[PDB]
Amino acid sequence: DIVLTQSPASLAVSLGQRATISCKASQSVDYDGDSYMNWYQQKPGQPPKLLIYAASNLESGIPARFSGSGSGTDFTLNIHPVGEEDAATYYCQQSHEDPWTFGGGTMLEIKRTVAAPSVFIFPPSDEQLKSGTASVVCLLNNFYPREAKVQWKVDNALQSGNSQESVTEQDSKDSTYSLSSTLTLSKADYEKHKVYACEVTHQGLSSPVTKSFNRGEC
Amino acid sequence: QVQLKQSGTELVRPGTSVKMSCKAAGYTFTDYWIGWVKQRPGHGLEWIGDFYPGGDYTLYSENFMGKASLTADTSSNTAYMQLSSLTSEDSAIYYCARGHYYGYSYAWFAYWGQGTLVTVSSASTKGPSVFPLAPSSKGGTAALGCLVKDYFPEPVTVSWNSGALTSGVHTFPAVLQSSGLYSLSSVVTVPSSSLGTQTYICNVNHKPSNTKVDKRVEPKSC
């Protein structure tokens, strides 16, 4: 098979600047003056989108901020100027001989200004408490960079092993992330404690932010 | 316009086969190869095989020999892929895509189906409960949402106000809980001044269970 090695695996590029992604093939993909290498963009929930075909041809409808170069075994995809909407994973793919093979992908992060999260806490709903389980949700909205620490405290005791986090893909309009953390307790354990707190640490915050509620106090 | 429309989400048992479809419109179906591609987290994109409906020609990856079978029904412009001897390694999103001739190849895939998600499992389908994430009683901007709990298999989709509210919405990737069931939250930030005058409804769809829930999220009056 023709093996394709992409580099880097992940790349962060400043808004407005140039992103360059490399793809190296284990054998030449040239024939009769054309280089049989393609580039795709993929965002979560969507199929891949063809950007560049035969190394340098811009697919109709794709912005000319995208360009491709190279021949033989060495190819590049260039994006300039980078915009918020370019956050995505990019793949090379060769069409020279079967099996058709893809590179491993490169995730592109768009580097924007630091933005602190806005933090919100949600108690379990009365509807859910009818069922014997309690989900407590902490939301961190529209922050950058991605690194963030969320710690749960119940009656000031730090929790471990009973929460799960989910982070959005980078936003295609403002280049921020958002994060949800869900603390799961049995109803029996939930009613044994009073203070439920989410503590958030992030580069954009001068000191950790804590959001909390007292069970039943509403 | 060239369009490829794939069949819906599948939940199928290990050891069996699954047959999914890709219906084409906007071009002469018998004149173009349809390629099939597998996407599984941690494994990028992997090509399975190609099918030419104008003659029933096949081309497979050696890794799918004896595993994938490609066919078509030209009377309905529909291509099919069957995957046999299913295991958890076959849980993935599967795409169809149309190739076109440029130079001396056709593997330039410009048009893609939306994908078919396949889960290989013997566990039963379970539609979710939907709970409100009510806007706090304690500013300029308030956050509210819906918690979609305890469903299987993926996926769930969420809209707000039937698609009229899109700004400020974040629908999070689902998490696989240790119960073996998925959960996800969808949130939106809105003007706190709108909480008494604007209605907020999350529209939750879990097609595998035909569970469709419209949940009104109101401020908690305490």
Residue numbers in the entry:
A (entry chain B): 1 to 27, 27A, 27B, 27C, 27D, 28 to 214
B (entry chain A): 1 to 52, 52A, 53 to 82, 82A, 82B, 82C, 83 to 100, 100A, ...
Question: From the publication, what sentences describe this entry?
Answer:
Human immunodeficiency virus type 1 (HIV-1) envelope (Env), a heterotrimer of gp120-gp41 subunits, mediates fusion of the viral and host cell membranes after interactions with the host receptor CD4 and a coreceptor. CD4 binding induces rearrangements in Env trimer, resulting in a CD4-induced (CD4i) open Env conformation. For comparison, we also structurally characterized CG10, a CD4i antibody isolated from a gp120-sCD4-immunized mouse that was developed to characterize conformational rearrangements of gp120 associated with receptor binding.
The crystal structure of unbound CG10 Fab showed ordered complementarity-determining regions (CDRs) on both the antibody heavy and light chains. Comparison of the VH-VL domains in the bound and unbound Fab structures showed that the conformational changes came mainly from the CDRH3 loop, while the rest of CDRs remained similar when bound to the sCD4-B41 complex (root mean square deviation [RMSD] = ~1.5 Å for superimposition of 235 VH-VL Cα residues). V2i antibodies elicited during natural HIV-1 infection that exhibited CD4i antibody characteristics were compared to CG10, a CD4i antibody that was elicited in a mouse immunized with a gp120-sCD4 complex.
